[PDB]
Ligand binder design. Structure first.
Ligand SMILES: Nc1nc2c(ncn2[C@@H]2O[C@H](COP(=O)(O)OP(=O)(O)OP(=O)(O)O)[C@@H](O)[C@H]2O)c(=O)[nH]1
Ligand SMILES: Nc1nc2c(ncn2[C@@H]2O[C@H](COP(=O)(O)OP(=O)(O)OP(=O)(O)O)[C@@H](O)[C@H]2O)c(=O)[nH]1
Ligand SMILES: Nc1nc2c(ncn2[C@@H]2O[C@H](COP(=O)(O)OP(=O)(O)O)[C@@H](O)[C@H]2O)c(=O)[nH]1
Ligand SMILES: Nc1nc2c(ncn2[C@@H]2O[C@H](COP(=O)(O)OP(=O)(O)O)[C@@H](O)[C@H]2O)c(=O)[nH]1
Ligand SMILES: [Mg+2]
Ligand SMILES: [Mg+2]
Lengths: 102, 48, 27, 430, 442, 430, 442
């Protein structure tokens, strides 16, 4: 449009994600990708750790331990304070806070 | 004329080979699928 | 009546690109 | 080109049961899983929805998730229930409590890893994966919270594929639960960011379909779920049978969505008529075309007469001429010019498929992108504002842990969706 | 002598089925690829060689490739009636379609598939000794036909150089429509097609529907009828290579006679004795009557009226029992007409061809049997009206960037829209400038 | 190429009994010792595990050791017990008392010479000797003390052979004995110096295998010992049958161990599925490979997702194409690339053997070298530090004669092992 | 006339089974060593003499040794179908493998077995009167193939001297892999192999898998298919010794024509009519078509692309019904192509051979029956990329001393790693420098 943008219309800069092109132009990423590993599907399937559509730095998300619960129907989990104590659903949920990077 | 007849005979041989290859492919596909029988579960759930 | 309606469900599976094509050569 | 199905909550599992009945009927699969069909055309695309298990058997590529196992024992007890893989049933122990925050934060995070493991197991087995299909209600508890959680995880893992949802939204007239507005508002906020294309159904519209069009004396939830399963199995028909003008989910999305937020669609299915009337009218393309645009046959409470069509799509099944399709769509476009958004020169896509559903000569499914969908969200927002101004039941959600700012986020996002539709409704060429 | 056919996407493969059905039935090759053994003609004819090659065991195989991004149509060809005729390498199929996106065909997916196609075409071109052009069938309304057709024609044009490339092209009809985004794909295709095609013939389904309703007595036509008409046209144009005649016409002659300036290469096509069997017995069908027929706008296969422009060149192909004196008398009578006007810089407006082989009759066909036919391709300024209407449709949508994010996401700069629209605007001005009389400019 | 097995203590003797049942079944040996098999392929490598005594019969090259004879009377009472050579059972007259020092220094040295005499008699009879295989628990008393004593003596006497151990270590969750941390720490200290390759098993992981994967209603220690016997008999399969790509214990060690302290490995075996579910999913190489890397199917509590794979090995049994094996192992390496150590360009070895385990058409066993094993040792060291700081039970060990400096040395050596694993576990962008 | 075959380790013995199956079936020796001579030819025959010797009772025995450190594969040969064909002394087996360690094979274990191998080879060479080279089959990825193959080639090179040694070698594929330590063994092998081999032919299993999927219609190939293809290639190259022909080619001609400088002796190999029966019956297979086939990189049995380099020499072997004029026309057509490039210092780029015996068809085989075939071995600078990726993987592992304690414990100085890596660096520089145009160097 022939006009210059007003102060109200310049608030759109905050809502968008910006990046450089290969030749030095400034653009906007329409659809950002996950900063962890993900899939691009074509004639073949491939995993990309990093892709230009990502907005944040690449990182490996933490995961919950698979063997956290007791081997049985009883409600016993591993404690959040140490590696050997146990806990249950009394006054708190121990299954939701077992996520760790390592 | 002799050369043409020889070419025709070779074509017929190729047809026969095609049929044999189809049969072999079916047999190999049957061979490569997996199966389970009773010796798999013999050692589980005995309570001894 | 029953046999006609039973036969009416078999002909619903047909393709249209080679509809009626036979390939016979006029002399 | 393989689809993976996810079934969530009571409504989702029941609709799924009827869907897999319809699909097993169309491909001639016995409830034991044995192929018993009568034409090669049935067999040659069976891979699209079924995986092959050893010595004859076929298994359906679907994941069933629910927070209380009551439903799962019912689906396993149903007539086709045996076909489902036992390892594909995922369930918890305590209920969702009709609470979005409980379903999303406490039992959601407990189960979500096992559902993602099953979904990955199903996805990585395909030679080429097409989009996911999800059925759930937005008014419930586990349906809303875990459905939107799972949608977010799958959208993180497969951003280049298609994400499709079928969703039930609470009637303004006949609610089964008091806290429906909160769960609906939070779920629509999640969907408008995450989804590529979303279909919305009102139970009130299915009741009006059954009573006025089908004249059923005593309808049941099985009939509503049968209508939904019919459209769901119809949308994919061109993916899996030959035709004169093939079409695809991605081609539908490319022709239907002008801008990425405007992805909410209306649904209809045309050949519906009562057993008394059936002796009086033969199937033909004009009859299907007249019924498809009749608001009596549309599955949402909003009516097209208060809005404008941005785009529409029609998929025809059966042996029929292309000339009649083209000329019908031309005549409707020329004759009805006020109901079509004027800065797009042609709003309707057509598609033609050779293979009808068994025992019907012809069928069409209609998908419509109309701005009158804004009226439903505004109505839900009204009921939310009535409840929210007085903090009517908020302590349950806050006790789970939500900040009140989440509710203001969901209100702002729904209000912006309504505003964007209203602005595009009143746009002009100048 | 030889010609290679390239069939792209859905329309091009379906039209290919009708074409190869016709060429088989005209030459006499059986569906399995073997000549009948009951005939004892004694002579061992070779005329098929333009379209078929023999291995040596006497099977025939055709000089064609079928290219598609979705499997279904090519698998239908593989499972159809002509299954044994084609070599399996010729039938190439991808995994997933270009989803009505020109950008998806050109940048993302066709760029992956194109090298297999080029290797197959090379393998064909190596088995020739007098190749004299490529025939290409595609639609510009869909994504893979536009994007991969343009990319492949571009690569062919660099690799083969001077060899001629003739396109048969289905353009978006003026009120029949199949997809919303048709103008963008047709504009972007046409931008590439200006540089990289020698003659382009345009077809619209609305015209062939009108022609089949008015002349034939078909109330409910479908694509197989249109494809059989197209096959007849292609057979008429290529008959000059294959049978004896008074005035032959090589594929290189079209570009020399029809194209005055290197951008002005889009031509209109029509065909005369489209008539039903019941009408055929009420009327004689002489040379002058069918010559008068080819000039009526009701005969055209593109929805344009040539009365709104001026002709630059006409090429008239006669096949069957025709004598040159009747062709000359007919053309002089046409020249007399007042609603037919030629640009003053083109005094010698006509090219003629005369071939003795009458048109073949297909067992299931809808055309009557006739002893003679004529087909015309002509260059006229009226063509500017088709582009102008595709432009307004592009301008109305592009004013709001209605769908552009799909194209930009699939790999295209936004700038490419403006470039193509400005090039088509310049083409419109070219058609205004070329048609101005020299007497007015002194 | 002959293997000698050693089974020590109750757990070791029970696992050995199940192992020799499985091996006797695969070679068709009757419990009387008579050959009753049905193919020559069985005979041509029978020497690998059996020695031949005159007039047909075969006897298994195994030494049975325990400190109290209760288990020996139980194994003699078992279904295959008669096959064992009477002179090969060595036992004392009083128990280990769950004390490492008792098992190692006082009652150990009295018997150990007779065990070494039997082991030397058995070793010098082989025409060519392959490595030793030892089964024992680390948490017990005679298992830990006499197993590590014997390992040290055999490593002194046969330093050029292979020393392989399978070892069970106490769960933090499901323990039978209070003084487990001391015995575990001292045994791990002995193993990291003495062993060439060591496999570790948690009873908790086998319970989770049985309950989640096999859905057993009433599991028993016999099932746990069958899972262990299955993997142990699978590792040696390429030694004793033909195949397209032979493999060997030494070849496994050469490809798995980058540096000599990093020799502790995880184990898995893929075709596990409940009798009810097996009808719903056929076995195939993609399915076996996917289960093979699934942590649900791994026999330790530590999860691979918290570490990275240095190396892995897969041994396939059955008639199968090499292309599918190669391309599947490539696909798994490419798809999970963040979990593989980047300064090794390809981490996986494959091997293919023609003859599957009885009653399965095909099977694979998985051996993995992953840094997540450090979490197990850290947990044991933590429990040790809680007990050791307070001198909780040390007077028993000191009364037997142990120096506390032994405890501080063993703690320091395990801590250095944990540090070495920890440096390689985490990435370093720099 | 005579040639002796040496098979080492697992790949070499398994490829040997397919080779000797083929040579038996082509000459006509029964599996028990007999010749049912049924022809009325009047005089006896000698073509077998290259590969078999007779005792005098008329049994045939073959000129080969099978060398392995593990028993299983050779015991499988001993118990198989050909038990009576081989002399039992010829099948030599140790007790235990080299465990993927080159050092273990070379220093510890192969040093004990190597003297038996030389005594057997000497006993064979004494029963000859015109030995004209050794053919060697081994893989450089495994321990015994690398270590004992190098040690044995060194000893052979000292004892026999000038006699030619031609190797067919399976190199580690660029991304499919079977063992972790492949780069160390391949580098150390190539270091020993540089001095002591006259021509080395490179094979990759990944290429033969691609070829069997693409050309043949096999979804699930296994090593027997690859080994049968290798056997066909060796039979094509040795046919010039065994049957009548227009232009023969002795094994000494390869080294003279293919190797320009003494380090540049690694050659690419390809074979043209690898084809299934259905494709073979859809197409004629003339000389020019198979000549065009041998130059596509899709035809090669090693995973390298020759378009990234320049050809230095080509050797073309035609067998079957071929005429020299067609060979000349084909080679001139290849020379015309612009995407095929020769180094400017090699103007006369081609060697030709023409033999009359067409390729044999094996009863269980997957190749079609064809009247003619061509086989190519060629020297090209593109080969430098194979070494560069092996060297990069070596640098990655050796930068952290990833496995060195095994090699140092089994008897090797650490210095040998640096020596070999510097020699391969110099080989890379040789292939970089040789490809530099003369006009730039004035
Ligand atoms: N005359 C004629 N027109 C056809 C035929 N098939 C499709 N069309 C027309 O061509 C346009 C559609 O182009 P398509 O060929 O379907 O596009 P495409 O090449 O498949 O491109 P994708 O959809 O991306 O795969 C519409 O205008 C159709 O009406 C046909 O068989 N005959
Ligand atoms: N084409 C082909 N490749 C093979 C064959 N056998 C093994 N290989 C490949 O060669 C490499 C393995 O080399 P091996 O021959 O097994 O090594 P080795 O000679 O036995 O050496 P050791 O393991 O120490 O006994 C791998 O890349 C295998 O894929 C075969 O029969 N044909
Ligand atoms: N159409 C349809 N609606 C259903 C069905 N079952 C439940 N509902 C509706 O969904 C809402 C209840 O949600 P529900 O599925 O129980 O939520 P959940 O507890 O999270 O699974 C109510 O409006 C019900 O009327 C069904 O089978 N079909
Ligand atoms: N898997 C398995 N574990 C066992 C068996 N017997 C004992 N255990 C476990 O081993 C530990 C006891 O060690 P034990 O074998 O008694 O030590 P020992 O007295 O030195 O032989 C406990 O954790 C038991 O649960 C068995 O047969 N199988
Ligand atoms: Mg298409
Ligand atoms: Mg070996």
């Amino acid at each position: 449009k022939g006009r210059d943008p007003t102060e109200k219309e310049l608030l759109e800069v905050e809502r968008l994600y910006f990046a450089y092109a290969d030749d030095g132009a400034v653009g906007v990423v329409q659809k950002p990708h996950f900063h962890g590993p993900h899939m691009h599907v074509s004639i073949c399937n491939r995993k990309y750790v990093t892709c230009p559509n990502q907005v944040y730095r690449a990182s490996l998300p933490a995961v919950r331990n698979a063997r956290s619960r007791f081997p049985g129907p009883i409600p016993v989990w591993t404690s959040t304070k140490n590696l050997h104590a146990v806990a249950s659903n009394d006054t708190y949920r121990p299954g939701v806070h077992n996520v760790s990077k390592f | 004329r002799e050369r043409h007849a020889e070419r025709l005979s070779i074509a017929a041989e190729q047809m026969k080979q095609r049929e044999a290859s189809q049969i072999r492919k079916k047999q190999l596909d049957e061979l490569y699928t997996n199966q389970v029988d009773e010796d798999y579960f013999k050692y589980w759930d005995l309570c001894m | 009546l029953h046999e006609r309606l039973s036969s009416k469900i078999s002909n619903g599976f047909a393709s249209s690109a080679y509809w009626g094509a036979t390939g016979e050569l006029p002399p | 080109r393989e689809i993976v199905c996810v079934q969530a909550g009571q409504c989702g599992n029941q609709i799924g049961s009827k869907f897999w009945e319809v699909i097993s009927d169309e491909h001639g699969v016995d409830p034991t899983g044995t192929y018993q069909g009568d034409s090669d055309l049935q067999l040659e695309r069976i891979n699209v929805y079924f995986d092959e298990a050893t010595g004859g058997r076929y298994v359906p590529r679907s994941v069933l998730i629910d927070l209380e196992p009551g439903t799962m024992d019912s689906v396993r007890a149903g007539p086709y229930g045996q076909i489902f893989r036992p390892d594909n049933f995922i369930f918890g122990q305590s209920g969702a409590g009709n609470n979005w925050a409980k379903g999303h934060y406490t039992e959601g995070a407990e189960l979500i890893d096992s559902v993602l493991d099953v979904c990955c197991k199903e996805a990585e087995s395909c030679d080429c994966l097409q989009g996911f299909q999800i059925c759930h209600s937005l008014g419930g508890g586990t349906g809303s919270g875990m459905g939107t959680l799972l949608i977010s995880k799958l959208r993180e893992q497969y951003p280049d594929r298609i994400m499709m949802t079928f969703s039930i939204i609470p009637s303004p007239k006949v609610s089964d639960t008091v806290v429906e507005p909160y769960n609906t508002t939070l779920s629509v906020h999640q969907l408008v960011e995450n989804s590529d294309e979303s279909m919305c159904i009102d139970n009130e519209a299915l009741y009006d379909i059954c009573f006025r069009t089908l004249k059923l004396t005593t309808p049941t939830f099985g009939d509503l779920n049968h209508l939904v399963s019919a459209v769901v199995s119809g949308v994919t028909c061109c993916l899996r049978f030959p035709g004169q003008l093939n079409s695809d989910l991605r081609k539908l999305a490319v022709n239907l969505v002008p801008f990425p937020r405007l992805h909410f669609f209306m649904m209809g299915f045309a050949p519906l008529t009562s057993r008394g009337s059936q002796q009086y009218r033969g199937l033909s393309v004009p009859e299907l075309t007249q019924q498809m645009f009749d608001a009596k046959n549309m599955m949402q409470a909003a009516d097209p007469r208060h809005g404008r069509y941005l785009t529409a799509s029609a998929l025809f099944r059966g042996r029929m001429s292309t000339k009649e399709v083209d000329e019908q769509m031309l005549n409707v476009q020329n004759k009805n010019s006020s109901y079509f958004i004027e800065w797009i020169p042609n709003n309707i896509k057509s598609s033609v498929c050779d293979i009808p559903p068994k025992g019907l000569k012809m069928a069409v499914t209609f998908i419509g992108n109309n701005t009158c969908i804004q009226e439903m969200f505004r109505r839900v927002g009204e009921q939310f504002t009535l409840m929210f101004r007085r903090k009517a039941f908020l302590h349950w959600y806050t006790g789970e842990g939500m900040d009140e700012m989440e509710f203001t986020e969901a209100e702002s996002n729904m209000n912006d969706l309504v505003s964007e539709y209203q602005q595009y409704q009143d746009a002009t060429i100048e | 002598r030889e010609a290679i056919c390239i069939h792209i996407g859905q329309a091009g493969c379906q039209v290919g089925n009708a074409c190869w059905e016709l060429f088989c039935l005209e030459h006499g090759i059986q569906p399995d690829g073997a000549m009948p053994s009951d005939k004892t003609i004694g002579v061992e004819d070779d005329a098929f060689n333009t379209f078929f090659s023999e291995t040596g065991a006497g099977k025939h195989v055709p000089r064609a490739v079928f290219l598609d991004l979705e499997p279904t149509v090519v698998d239908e060809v593989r499972t159809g009636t002509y299954r044994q005729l084609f070599h399996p390498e010729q039938l190439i199929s991808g995994k997933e379609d270009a989803a009505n996106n020109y950008a998806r065909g050109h940048y993302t997916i066709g760029k992956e598939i194109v090298d297999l196609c080029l290797d197959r075409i090379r393998k064909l071109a190596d088995n020739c000794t007098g190749l004299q052009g490529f025939l290409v069938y595609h639609a510009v309304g869909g994504g893979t036909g536009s994007g991969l057709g343009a990319l492949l024609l571009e690569r062919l044009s660099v690799d083969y150089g001077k060899k001629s490339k003739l396109g048969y092209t289905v353009y978006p009809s003026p009120q029949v429509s199949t997809a919303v985004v048709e103008p963008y794909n047709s504009v972007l295709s046409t931008h590439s097609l200006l540089e990289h095609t020698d003659v382009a013939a345009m077809l619209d389904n609305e015209a062939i529907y009108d022609l089949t309703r008015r002349n034939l007595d078909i109330e409910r036509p479908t694509y197989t009828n249109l494809n059989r008409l197209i096959g007849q046209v292609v057979s008429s144009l290529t008959a000059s290579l294959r049978f004896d005649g008074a005035l032959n016409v090589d594929l290189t002659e079209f570009q020399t006679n029809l194209v005055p300036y290197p951008r002005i290469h889009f031509v209109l096509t029509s065909y005369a004795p489209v008539i039903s069997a019941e009408k055929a017995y009420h009327e004689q069908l002489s040379v002058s009557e069918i010559s008068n027929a080819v000039f009526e706008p009701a005969s055209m296969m593109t929805k344009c009226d040539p009365r709104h422009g001026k002709y630059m060149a006409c090429c008239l192909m006669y096949r069957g029992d025709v004598v040159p004196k009747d062709v000359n008398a007919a053309v002089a009578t046409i020249k007399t007409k007042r609603t037919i006007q030629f640009v003053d810089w083109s005094p010698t407006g006509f090219k003629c061809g005369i071939n003795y082989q009458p048109p073949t009759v297909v067992p299931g066909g809808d055309l009557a049997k006739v002893q003679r036919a004529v087909c015309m391709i002509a260059n006229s300024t009226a063509i500017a009206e088709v582009f102008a209407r595709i432009d307004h449709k592009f301008d109305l949508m592009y004013s709001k960037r209605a769908f552009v994010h799909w194209y930009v996401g699939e790999g295209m700069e936004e700038g490419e829209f403006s470039e193509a629209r400005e090039d088509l605007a310049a083409l419109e001005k070219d058609y205004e400038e070329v048609g101005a009389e020299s007497a007015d400019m002194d």
